Structure 1
Amino acid sequence: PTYGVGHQPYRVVVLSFELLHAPATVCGPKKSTNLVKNKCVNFNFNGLK
């Protein structure tokens, strides 16, 4: 710690995510909103838009 911030160790983590022919199992976040019925709404469910 007697040195400056220039040459201090920065813990480095590299992410490698290559896509192949295997089925995907880990995805990104899925946002959601509150439901209000008895009116014509654009539904955007998992596979039924």
Structure 2
Amino acid sequence: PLQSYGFQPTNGVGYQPYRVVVLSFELLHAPATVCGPKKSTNLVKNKCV
């Protein structure tokens, strides 16, 4: 069922290998485990904040 790719150094652009990473973001009606970073800002000194 499986076959290797003909990934030759002589292949044109449409036949070159490309790496793909897909970042899938899952949101359920549940506590969000991937959480915590409520937007933060930089410190500013010697001014009213």
Query: If the length of structure 1 is used for normalisation, what is the TM-score?
Result: 0.45
Note the C-alpha offset of 1:31. 6.5
Percent of aligned positions with the same letter in both sequences? 95
Q: How many residues align?
A: 41
Unpaired runs of 5+ residues, structure 2, are 1-8
- Per-residue CA deviations over 1:8-44 (Å, capped at 9, x if unaligned) read 1211222211210121122486665553456421xxx
Please state which structure has a larger fraction of its residues in helix. Answer: 2
Structure ranking higher on relative contact order (CA contacts 8 Å, 6+ apart): 2
Q: Which one has the largest radius of gyration? A: 2
